[PDB]
PDB file of C-alpha atoms and ligand atoms in Angstrom:
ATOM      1  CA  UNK D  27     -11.889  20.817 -12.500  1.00 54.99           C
ATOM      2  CA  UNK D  28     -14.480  19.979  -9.881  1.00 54.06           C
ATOM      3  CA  UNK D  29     -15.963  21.850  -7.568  1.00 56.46           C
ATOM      4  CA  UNK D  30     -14.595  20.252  -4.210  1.00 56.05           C
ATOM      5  CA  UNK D  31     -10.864  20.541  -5.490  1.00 56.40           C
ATOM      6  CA  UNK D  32      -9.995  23.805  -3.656  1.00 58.97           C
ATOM      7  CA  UNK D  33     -12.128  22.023  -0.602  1.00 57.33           C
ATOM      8  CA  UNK D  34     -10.076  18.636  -0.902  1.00 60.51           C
ATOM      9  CA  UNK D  35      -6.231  20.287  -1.363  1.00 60.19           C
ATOM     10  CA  UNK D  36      -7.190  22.451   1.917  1.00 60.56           C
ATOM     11  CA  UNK D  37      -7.906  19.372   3.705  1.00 59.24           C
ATOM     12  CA  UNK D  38      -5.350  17.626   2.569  1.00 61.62           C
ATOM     13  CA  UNK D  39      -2.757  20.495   3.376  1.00 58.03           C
ATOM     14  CA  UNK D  40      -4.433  20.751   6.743  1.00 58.96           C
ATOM     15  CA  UNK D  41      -3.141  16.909   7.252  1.00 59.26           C
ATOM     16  CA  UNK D  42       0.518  17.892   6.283  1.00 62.95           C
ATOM     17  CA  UNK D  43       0.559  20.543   8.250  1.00 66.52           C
ATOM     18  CA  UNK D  44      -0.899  18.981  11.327  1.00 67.02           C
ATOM     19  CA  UNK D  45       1.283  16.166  10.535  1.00 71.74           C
ATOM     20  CA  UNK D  46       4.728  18.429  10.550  1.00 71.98           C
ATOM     21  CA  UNK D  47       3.593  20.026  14.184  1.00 67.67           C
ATOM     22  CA  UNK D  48       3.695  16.438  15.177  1.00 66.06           C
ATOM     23  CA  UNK D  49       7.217  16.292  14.711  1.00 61.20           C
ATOM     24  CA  UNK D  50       6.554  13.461  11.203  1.00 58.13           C
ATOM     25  CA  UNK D  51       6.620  14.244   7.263  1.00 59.44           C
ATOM     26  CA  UNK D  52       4.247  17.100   6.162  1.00 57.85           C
ATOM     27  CA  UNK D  53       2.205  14.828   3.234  1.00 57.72           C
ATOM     28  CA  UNK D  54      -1.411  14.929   4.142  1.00 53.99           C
ATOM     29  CA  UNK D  55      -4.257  13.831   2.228  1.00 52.11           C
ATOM     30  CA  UNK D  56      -7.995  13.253   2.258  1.00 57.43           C
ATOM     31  CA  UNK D  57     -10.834  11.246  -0.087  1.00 54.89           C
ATOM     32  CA  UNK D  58     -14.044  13.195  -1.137  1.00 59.14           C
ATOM     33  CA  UNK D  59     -17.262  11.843  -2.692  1.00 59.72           C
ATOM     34  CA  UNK D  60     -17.651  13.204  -5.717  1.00 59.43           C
ATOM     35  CA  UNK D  61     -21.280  13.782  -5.735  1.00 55.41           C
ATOM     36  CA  UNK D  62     -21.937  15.962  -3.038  1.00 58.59           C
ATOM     37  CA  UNK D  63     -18.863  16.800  -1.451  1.00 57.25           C
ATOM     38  CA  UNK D  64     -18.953  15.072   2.142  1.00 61.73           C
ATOM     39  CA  UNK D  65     -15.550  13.822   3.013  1.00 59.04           C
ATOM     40  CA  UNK D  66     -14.833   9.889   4.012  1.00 58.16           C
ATOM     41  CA  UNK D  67     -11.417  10.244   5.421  1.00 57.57           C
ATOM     42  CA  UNK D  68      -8.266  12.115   6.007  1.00 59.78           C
ATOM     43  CA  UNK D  69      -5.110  11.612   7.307  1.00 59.08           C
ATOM     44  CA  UNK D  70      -0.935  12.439   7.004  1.00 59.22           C
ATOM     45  CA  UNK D  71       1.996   9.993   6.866  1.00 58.48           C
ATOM     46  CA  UNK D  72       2.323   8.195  10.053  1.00 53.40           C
ATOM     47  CA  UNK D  73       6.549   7.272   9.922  1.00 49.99           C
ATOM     48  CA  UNK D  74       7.032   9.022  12.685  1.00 50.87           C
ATOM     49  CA  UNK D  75       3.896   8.968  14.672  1.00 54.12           C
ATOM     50  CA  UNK D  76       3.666   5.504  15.060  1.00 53.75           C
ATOM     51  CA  UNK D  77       7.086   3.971  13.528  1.00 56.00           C
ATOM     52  CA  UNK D  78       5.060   2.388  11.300  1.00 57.07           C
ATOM     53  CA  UNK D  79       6.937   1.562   7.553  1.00 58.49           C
ATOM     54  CA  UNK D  80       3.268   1.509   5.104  1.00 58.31           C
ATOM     55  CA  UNK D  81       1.028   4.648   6.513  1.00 57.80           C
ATOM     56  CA  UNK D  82       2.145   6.978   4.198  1.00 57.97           C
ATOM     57  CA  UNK D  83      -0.509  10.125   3.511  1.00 59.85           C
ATOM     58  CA  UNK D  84      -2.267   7.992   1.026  1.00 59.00           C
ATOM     59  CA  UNK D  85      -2.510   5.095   2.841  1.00 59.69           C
ATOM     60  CA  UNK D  86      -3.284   7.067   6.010  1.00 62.17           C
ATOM     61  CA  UNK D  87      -6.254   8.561   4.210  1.00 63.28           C
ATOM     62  CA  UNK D  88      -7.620   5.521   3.334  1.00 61.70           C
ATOM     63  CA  UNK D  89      -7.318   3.512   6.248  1.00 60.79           C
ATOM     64  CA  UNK D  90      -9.012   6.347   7.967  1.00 61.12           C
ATOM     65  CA  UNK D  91     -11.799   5.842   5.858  1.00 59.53           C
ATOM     66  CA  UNK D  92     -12.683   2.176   7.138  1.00 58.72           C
ATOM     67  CA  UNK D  93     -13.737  -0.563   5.024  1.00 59.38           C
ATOM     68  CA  UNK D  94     -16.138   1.352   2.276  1.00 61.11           C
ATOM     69  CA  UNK D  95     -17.747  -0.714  -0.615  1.00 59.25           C
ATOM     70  CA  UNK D  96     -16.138  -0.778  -3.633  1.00 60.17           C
ATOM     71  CA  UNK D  97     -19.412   1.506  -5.041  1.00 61.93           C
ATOM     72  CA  UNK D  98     -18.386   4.269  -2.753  1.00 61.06           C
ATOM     73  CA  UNK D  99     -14.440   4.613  -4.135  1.00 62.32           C
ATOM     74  CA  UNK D 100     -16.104   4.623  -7.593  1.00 57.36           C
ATOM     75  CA  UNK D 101     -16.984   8.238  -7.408  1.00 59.20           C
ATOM     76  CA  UNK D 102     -14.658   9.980  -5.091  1.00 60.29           C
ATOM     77  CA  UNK D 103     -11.474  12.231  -5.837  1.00 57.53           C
ATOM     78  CA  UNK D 104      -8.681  11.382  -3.370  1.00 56.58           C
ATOM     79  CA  UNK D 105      -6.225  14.517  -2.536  1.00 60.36           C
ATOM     80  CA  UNK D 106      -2.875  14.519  -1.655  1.00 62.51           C
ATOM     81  CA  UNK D 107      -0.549  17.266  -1.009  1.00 63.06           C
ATOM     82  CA  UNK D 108       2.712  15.490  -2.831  1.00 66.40           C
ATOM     83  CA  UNK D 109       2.764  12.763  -6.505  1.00 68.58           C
ATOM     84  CA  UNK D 110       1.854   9.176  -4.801  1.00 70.05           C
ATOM     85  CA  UNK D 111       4.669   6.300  -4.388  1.00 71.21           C
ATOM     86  CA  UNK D 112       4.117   3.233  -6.118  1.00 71.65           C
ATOM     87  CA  UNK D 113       2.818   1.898  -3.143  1.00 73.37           C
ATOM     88  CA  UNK D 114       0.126   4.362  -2.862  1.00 69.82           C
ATOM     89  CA  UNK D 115      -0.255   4.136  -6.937  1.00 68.73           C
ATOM     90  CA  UNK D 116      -1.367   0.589  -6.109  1.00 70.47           C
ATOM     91  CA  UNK D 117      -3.752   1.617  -3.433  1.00 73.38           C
ATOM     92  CA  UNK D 118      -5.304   4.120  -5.710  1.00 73.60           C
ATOM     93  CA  UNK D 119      -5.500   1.498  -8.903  1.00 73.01           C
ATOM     94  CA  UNK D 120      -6.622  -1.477  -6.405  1.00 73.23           C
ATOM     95  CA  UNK D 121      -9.591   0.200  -4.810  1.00 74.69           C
ATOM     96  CA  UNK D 122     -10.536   2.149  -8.566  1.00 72.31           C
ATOM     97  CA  UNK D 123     -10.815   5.711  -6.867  1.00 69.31           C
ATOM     98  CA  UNK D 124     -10.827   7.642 -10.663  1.00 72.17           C
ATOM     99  CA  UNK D 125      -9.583  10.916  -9.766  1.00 72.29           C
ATOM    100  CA  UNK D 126      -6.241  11.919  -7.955  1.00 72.89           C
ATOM    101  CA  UNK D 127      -5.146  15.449  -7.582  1.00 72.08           C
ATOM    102  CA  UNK D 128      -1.936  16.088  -6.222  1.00 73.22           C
ATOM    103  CA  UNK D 129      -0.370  18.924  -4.444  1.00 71.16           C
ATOM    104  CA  UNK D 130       3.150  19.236  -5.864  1.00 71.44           C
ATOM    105  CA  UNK D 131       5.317  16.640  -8.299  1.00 70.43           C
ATOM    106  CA  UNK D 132       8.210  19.001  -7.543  1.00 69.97           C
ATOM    107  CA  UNK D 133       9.860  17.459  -4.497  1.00 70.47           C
ATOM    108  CA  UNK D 134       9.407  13.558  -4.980  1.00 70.18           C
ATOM    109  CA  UNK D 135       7.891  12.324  -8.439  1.00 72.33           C
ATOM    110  CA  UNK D 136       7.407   8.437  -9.116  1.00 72.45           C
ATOM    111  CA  UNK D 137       6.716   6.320 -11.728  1.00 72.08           C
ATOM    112  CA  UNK D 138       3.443   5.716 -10.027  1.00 73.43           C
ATOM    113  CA  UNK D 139       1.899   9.174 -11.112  1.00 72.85           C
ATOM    114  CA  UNK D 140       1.918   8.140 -15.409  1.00 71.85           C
ATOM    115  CA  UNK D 141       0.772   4.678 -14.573  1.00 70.11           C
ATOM    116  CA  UNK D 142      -2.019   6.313 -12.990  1.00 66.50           C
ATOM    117  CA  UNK D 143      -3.055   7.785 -16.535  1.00 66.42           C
ATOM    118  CA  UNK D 144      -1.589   4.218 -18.115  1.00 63.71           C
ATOM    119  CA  UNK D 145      -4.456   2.407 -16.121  1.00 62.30           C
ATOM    120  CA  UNK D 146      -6.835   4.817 -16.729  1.00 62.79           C
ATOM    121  CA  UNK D 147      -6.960   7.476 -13.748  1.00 63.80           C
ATOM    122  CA  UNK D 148      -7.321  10.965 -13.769  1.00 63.19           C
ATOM    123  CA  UNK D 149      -4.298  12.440 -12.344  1.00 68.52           C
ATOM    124  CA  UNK D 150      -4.555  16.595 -11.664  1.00 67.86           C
ATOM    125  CA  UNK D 151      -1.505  18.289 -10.782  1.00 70.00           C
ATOM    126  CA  UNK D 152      -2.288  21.610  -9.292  1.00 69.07           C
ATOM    127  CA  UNK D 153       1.272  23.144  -8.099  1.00 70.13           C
ATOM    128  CA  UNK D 154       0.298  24.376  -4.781  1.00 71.54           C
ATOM    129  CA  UNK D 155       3.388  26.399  -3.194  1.00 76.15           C
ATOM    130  CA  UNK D 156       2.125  25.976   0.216  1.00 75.47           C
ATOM    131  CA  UNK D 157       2.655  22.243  -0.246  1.00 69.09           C
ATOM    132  CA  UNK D 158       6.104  22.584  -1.855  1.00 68.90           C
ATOM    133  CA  UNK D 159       7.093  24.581   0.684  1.00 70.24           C
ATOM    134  CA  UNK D 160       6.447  22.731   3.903  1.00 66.86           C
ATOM    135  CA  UNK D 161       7.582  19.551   1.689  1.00 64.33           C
ATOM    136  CA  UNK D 162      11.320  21.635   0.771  1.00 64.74           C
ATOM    137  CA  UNK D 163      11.356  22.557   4.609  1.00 65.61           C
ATOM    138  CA  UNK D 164      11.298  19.355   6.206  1.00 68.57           C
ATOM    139  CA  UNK D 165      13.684  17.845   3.421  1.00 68.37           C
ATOM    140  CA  UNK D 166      16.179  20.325   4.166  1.00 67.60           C
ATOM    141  CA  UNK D 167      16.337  20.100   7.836  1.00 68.91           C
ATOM    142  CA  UNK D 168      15.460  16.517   8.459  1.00 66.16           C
ATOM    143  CA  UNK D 169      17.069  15.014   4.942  1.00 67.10           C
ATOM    144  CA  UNK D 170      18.348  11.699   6.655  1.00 65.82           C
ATOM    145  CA  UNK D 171      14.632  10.751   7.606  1.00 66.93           C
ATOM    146  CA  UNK D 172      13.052  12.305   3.965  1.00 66.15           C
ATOM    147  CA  UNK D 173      15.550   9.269   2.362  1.00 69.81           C
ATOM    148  CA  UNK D 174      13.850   6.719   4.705  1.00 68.94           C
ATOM    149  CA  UNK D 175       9.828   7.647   4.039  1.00 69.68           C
ATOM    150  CA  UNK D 176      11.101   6.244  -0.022  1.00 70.24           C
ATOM    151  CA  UNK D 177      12.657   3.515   0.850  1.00 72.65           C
ATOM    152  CA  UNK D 178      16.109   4.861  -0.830  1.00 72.29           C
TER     153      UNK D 178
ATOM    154  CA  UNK N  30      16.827 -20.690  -3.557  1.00 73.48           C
ATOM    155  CA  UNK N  31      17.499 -22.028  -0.262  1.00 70.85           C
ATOM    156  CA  UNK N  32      15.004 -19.958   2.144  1.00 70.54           C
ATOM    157  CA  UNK N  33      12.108 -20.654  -0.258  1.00 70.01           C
ATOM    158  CA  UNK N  34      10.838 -23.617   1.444  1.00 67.71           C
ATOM    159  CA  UNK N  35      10.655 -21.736   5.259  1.00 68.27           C
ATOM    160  CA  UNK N  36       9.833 -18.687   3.915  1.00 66.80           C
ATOM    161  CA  UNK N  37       6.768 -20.929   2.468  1.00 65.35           C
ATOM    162  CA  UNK N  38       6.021 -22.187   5.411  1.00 67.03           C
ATOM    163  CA  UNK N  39       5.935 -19.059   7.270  1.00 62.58           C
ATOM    164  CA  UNK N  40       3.926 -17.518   5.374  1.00 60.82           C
ATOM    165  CA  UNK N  41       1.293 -20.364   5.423  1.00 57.64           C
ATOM    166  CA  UNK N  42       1.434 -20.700   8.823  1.00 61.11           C
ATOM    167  CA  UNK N  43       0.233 -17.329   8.916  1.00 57.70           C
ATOM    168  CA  UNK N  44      -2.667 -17.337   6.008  1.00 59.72           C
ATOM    169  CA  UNK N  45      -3.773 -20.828   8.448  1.00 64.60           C
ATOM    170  CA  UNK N  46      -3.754 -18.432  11.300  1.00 68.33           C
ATOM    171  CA  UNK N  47      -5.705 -15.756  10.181  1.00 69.28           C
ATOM    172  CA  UNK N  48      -7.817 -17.996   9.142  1.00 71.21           C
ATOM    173  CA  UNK N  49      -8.423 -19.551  12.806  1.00 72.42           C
ATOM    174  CA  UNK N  50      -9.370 -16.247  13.543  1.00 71.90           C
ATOM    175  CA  UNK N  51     -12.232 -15.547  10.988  1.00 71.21           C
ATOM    176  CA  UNK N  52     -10.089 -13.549   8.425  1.00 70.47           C
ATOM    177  CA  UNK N  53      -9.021 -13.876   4.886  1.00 69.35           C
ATOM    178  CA  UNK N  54      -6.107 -16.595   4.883  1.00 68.41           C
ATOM    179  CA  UNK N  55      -3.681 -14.527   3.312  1.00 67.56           C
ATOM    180  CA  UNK N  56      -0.239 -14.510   5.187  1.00 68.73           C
ATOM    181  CA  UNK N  57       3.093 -13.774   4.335  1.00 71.54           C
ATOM    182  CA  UNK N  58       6.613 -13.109   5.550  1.00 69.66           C
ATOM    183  CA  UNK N  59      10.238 -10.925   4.975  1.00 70.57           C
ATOM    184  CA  UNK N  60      13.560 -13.318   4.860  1.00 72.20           C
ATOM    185  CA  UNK N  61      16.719 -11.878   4.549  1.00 69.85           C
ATOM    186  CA  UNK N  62      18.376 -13.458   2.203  1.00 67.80           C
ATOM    187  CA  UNK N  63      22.108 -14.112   3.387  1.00 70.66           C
ATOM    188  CA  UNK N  64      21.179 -15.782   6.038  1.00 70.55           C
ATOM    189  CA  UNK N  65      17.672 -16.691   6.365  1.00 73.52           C
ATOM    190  CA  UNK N  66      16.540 -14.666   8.986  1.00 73.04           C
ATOM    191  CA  UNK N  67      12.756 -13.382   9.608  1.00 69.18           C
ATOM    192  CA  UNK N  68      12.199  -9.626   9.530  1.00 70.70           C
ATOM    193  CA  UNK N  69       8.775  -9.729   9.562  1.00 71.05           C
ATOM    194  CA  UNK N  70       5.635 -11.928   8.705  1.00 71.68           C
ATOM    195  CA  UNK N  71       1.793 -11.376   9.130  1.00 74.16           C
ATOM    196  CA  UNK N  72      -1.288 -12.078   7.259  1.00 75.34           C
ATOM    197  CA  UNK N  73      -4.585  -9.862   6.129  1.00 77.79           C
ATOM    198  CA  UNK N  74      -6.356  -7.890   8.995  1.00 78.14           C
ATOM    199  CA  UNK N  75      -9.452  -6.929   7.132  1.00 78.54           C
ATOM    200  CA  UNK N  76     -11.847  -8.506   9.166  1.00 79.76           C
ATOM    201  CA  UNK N  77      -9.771  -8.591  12.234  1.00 78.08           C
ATOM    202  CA  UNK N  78      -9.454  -4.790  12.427  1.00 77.47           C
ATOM    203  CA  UNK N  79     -12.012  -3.737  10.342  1.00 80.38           C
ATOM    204  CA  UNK N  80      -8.691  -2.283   8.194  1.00 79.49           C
ATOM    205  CA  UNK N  81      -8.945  -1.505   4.447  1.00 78.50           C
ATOM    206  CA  UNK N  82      -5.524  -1.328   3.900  1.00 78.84           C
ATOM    207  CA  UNK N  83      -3.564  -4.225   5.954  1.00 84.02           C
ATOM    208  CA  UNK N  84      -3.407  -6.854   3.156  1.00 84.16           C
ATOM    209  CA  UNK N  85      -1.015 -10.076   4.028  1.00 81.89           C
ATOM    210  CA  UNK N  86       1.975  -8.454   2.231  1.00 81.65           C
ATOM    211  CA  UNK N  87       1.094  -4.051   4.035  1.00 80.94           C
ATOM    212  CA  UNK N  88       0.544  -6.203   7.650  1.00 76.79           C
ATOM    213  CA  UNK N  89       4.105  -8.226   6.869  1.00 76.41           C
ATOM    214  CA  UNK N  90       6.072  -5.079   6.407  1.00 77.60           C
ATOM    215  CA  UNK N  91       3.796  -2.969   9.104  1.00 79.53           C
ATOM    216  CA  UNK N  92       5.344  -5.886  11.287  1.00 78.99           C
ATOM    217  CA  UNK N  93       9.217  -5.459  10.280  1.00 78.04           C
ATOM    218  CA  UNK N  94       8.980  -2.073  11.734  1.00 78.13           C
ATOM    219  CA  UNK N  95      10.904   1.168   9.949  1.00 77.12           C
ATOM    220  CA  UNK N  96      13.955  -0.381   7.522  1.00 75.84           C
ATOM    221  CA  UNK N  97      17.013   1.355   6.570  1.00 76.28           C
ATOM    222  CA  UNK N  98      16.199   1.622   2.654  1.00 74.54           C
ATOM    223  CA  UNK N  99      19.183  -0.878   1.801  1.00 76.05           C
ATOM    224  CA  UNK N 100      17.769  -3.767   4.125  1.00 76.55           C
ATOM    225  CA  UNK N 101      14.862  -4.414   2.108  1.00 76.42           C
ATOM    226  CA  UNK N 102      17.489  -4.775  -1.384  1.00 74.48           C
ATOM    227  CA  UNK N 103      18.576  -8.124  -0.636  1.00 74.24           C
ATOM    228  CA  UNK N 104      15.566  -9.502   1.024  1.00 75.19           C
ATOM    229  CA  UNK N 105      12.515 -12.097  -0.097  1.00 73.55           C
ATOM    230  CA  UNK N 106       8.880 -11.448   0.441  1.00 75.23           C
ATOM    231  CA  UNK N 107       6.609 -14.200   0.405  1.00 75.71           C
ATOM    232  CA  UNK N 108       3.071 -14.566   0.340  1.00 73.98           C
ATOM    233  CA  UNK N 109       0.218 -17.015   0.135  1.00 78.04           C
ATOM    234  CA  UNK N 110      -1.508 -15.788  -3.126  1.00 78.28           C
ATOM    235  CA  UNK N 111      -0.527 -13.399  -6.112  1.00 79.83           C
ATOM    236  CA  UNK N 112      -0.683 -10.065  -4.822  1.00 79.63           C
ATOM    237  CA  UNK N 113      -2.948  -6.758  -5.827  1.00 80.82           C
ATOM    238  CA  UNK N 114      -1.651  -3.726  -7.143  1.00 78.80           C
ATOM    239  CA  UNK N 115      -0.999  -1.890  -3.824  1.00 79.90           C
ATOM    240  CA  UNK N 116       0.979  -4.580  -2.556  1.00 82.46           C
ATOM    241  CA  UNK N 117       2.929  -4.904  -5.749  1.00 82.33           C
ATOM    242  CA  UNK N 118       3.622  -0.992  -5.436  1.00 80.80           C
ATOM    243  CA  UNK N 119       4.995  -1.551  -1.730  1.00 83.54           C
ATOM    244  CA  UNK N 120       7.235  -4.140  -2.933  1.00 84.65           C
ATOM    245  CA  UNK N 121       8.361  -2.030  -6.213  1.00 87.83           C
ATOM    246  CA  UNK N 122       8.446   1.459  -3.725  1.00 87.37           C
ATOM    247  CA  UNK N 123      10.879  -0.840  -0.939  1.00 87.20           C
ATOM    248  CA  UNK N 124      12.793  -2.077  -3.915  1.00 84.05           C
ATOM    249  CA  UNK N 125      12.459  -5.516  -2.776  1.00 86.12           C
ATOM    250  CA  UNK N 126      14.481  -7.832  -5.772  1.00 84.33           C
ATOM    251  CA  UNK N 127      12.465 -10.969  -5.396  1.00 78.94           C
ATOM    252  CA  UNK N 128       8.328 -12.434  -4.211  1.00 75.15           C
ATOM    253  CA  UNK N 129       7.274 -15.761  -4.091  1.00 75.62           C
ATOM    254  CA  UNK N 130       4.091 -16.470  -4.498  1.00 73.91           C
ATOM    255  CA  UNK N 131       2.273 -19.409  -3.384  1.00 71.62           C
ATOM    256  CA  UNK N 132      -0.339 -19.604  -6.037  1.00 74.93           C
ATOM    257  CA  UNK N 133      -2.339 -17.526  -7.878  1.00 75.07           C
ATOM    258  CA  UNK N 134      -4.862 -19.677  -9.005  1.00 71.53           C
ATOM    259  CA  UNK N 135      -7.609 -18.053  -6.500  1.00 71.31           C
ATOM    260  CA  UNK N 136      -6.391 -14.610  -7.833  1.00 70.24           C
ATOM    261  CA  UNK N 137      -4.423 -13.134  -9.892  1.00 70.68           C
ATOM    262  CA  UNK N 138      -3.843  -9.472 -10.770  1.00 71.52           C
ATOM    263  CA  UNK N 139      -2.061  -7.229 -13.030  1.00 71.91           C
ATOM    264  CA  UNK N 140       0.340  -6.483 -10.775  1.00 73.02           C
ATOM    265  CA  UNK N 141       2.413  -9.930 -10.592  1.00 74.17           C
ATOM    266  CA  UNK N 142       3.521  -8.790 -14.530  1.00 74.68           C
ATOM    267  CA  UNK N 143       3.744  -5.106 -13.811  1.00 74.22           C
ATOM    268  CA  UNK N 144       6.691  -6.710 -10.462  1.00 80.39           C
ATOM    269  CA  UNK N 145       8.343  -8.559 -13.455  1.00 79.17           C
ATOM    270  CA  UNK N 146       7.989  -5.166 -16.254  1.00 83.75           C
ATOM    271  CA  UNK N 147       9.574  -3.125 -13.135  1.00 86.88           C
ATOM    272  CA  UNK N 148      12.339  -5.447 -13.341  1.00 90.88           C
ATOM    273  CA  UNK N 149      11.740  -7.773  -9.850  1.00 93.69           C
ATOM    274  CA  UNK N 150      11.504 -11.700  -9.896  1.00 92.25           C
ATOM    275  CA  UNK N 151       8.263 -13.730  -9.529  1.00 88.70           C
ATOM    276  CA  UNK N 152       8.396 -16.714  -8.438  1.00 88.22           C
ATOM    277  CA  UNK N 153       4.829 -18.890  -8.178  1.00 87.60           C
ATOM    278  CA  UNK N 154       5.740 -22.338  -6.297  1.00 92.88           C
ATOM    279  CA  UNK N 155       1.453 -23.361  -7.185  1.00 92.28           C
ATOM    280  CA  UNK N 156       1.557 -24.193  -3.435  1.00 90.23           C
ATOM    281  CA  UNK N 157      -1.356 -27.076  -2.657  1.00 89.14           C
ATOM    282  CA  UNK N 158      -1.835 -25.743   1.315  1.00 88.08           C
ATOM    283  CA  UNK N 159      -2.428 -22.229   0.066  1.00 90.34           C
ATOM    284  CA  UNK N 160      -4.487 -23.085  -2.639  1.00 88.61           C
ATOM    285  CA  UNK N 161      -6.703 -25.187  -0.492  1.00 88.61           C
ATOM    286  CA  UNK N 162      -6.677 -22.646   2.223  1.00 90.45           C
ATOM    287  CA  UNK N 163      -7.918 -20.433  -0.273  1.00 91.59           C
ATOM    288  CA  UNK N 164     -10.812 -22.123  -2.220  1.00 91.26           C
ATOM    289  CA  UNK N 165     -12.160 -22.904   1.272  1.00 88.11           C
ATOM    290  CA  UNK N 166     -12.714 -19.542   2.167  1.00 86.15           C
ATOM    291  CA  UNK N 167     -14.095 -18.637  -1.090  1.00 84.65           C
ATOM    292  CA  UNK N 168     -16.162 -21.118  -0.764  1.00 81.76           C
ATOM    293  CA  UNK N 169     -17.230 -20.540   2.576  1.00 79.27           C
ATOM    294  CA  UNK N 170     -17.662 -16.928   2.261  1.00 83.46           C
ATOM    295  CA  UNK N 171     -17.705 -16.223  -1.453  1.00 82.03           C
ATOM    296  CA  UNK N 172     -19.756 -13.022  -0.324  1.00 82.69           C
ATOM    297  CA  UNK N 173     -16.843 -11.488   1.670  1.00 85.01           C
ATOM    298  CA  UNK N 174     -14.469 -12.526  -1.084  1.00 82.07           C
ATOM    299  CA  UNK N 175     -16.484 -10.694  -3.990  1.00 84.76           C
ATOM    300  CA  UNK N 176     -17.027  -7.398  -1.795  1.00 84.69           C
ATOM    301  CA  UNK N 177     -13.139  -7.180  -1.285  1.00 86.57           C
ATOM    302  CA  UNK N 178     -11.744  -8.082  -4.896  1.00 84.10           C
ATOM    303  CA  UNK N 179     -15.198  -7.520  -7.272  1.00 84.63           C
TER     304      UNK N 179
HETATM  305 ZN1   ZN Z 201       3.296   6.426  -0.829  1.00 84.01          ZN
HETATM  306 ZN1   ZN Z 202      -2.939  -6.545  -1.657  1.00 84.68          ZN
END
């Protein structure tokens, strides 16, 4: 494990909880440089927010970074507090960030999270309760728009 | 199928207009498929917003707005050139059945045969426009090219 993991799931919890006071879905995430722990971005899913169908957590976090080179995603670990959707797979395969730790794979698990390992990413499940928690939460009260964030 | 040739030319029309304004001519559109109507189109806002995410196919569905899930099961995306793996996820996370591609003789990535393993149809109509469109930009600005997909 590395040493900015308890730093990055914080964050990243931090987003999903900010994002649930906003009234949206509690997945927050962030993306940490590897090397000396500054972070490049954060963010939580943005359905809600700003209506918007492709800023999930992941993709939240990353467009929050702005446009890095492609050295810079080489050596970061990007956090999220719940296992990516194939869309956010993508993201992490396309832009080669090696290490993904995740939150929880207990209240929405993809296919995205083994072809992670299949392509050759790191993929670090941690099973944070605070994260399943909030996540079990806004599924049970708001399950109509929890169907909508996976396209179902 | 019947929509292929608009949806084509949508999604060209696009990629030539975000070209016009100094980005990456990369456009696309949604088309449902009964009837042929537009849900959505747009092309690649990297250099227009300074965005690292809003590839043609993210900024076509940004622009269709929240979907009911079952809208996007009988739809069509199309897009200018063979897309990367992040918009091959958001087509495999909307469950959208079929892409057409214009070419993807400029690029091509793993993810056009990961959309067929997952069980989606690809469809690559070797467009001339869109390949044209392309090399220019390459071309042009091979530098901005590498930086994005090196
Ligand atoms: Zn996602
Ligand atoms: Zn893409």
């Amino acid at each position: 494990a590395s040493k900015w993991d308890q730093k990055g799931m914080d964050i990243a919890y931090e987003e999903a909880a900010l994002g649930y006071k906003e009234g949206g879905v509690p997945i927050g995430g962030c993306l940490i440089n590897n090397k000396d722990g500054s972070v490049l971005g954060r963010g939580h899913n943005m359905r809600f927010q700003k209506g918007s169908a492709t800023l999930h957590g992941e993709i939240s976090t990353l467009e929050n970074c702005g446009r890095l080179e492609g050295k810079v995603y080489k050596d970061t670990t990007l956090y999220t507090t719940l296992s990516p959707c194939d869309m956010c797979t993508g993201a992490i395969i396309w832009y080669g960030i090696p290490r993904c730790v995740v939150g929880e794979n207990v209240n929405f698990k993809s296919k995205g999270e083994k072809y992670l390992q299949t392509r050759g990413h790191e993929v670090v499940v941690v099973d944070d309760e605070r994260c399943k928690k909030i996540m079990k939460q806004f599924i049970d009260e708001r399950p109509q728009d929890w169907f909508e964030d996976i396209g179902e």
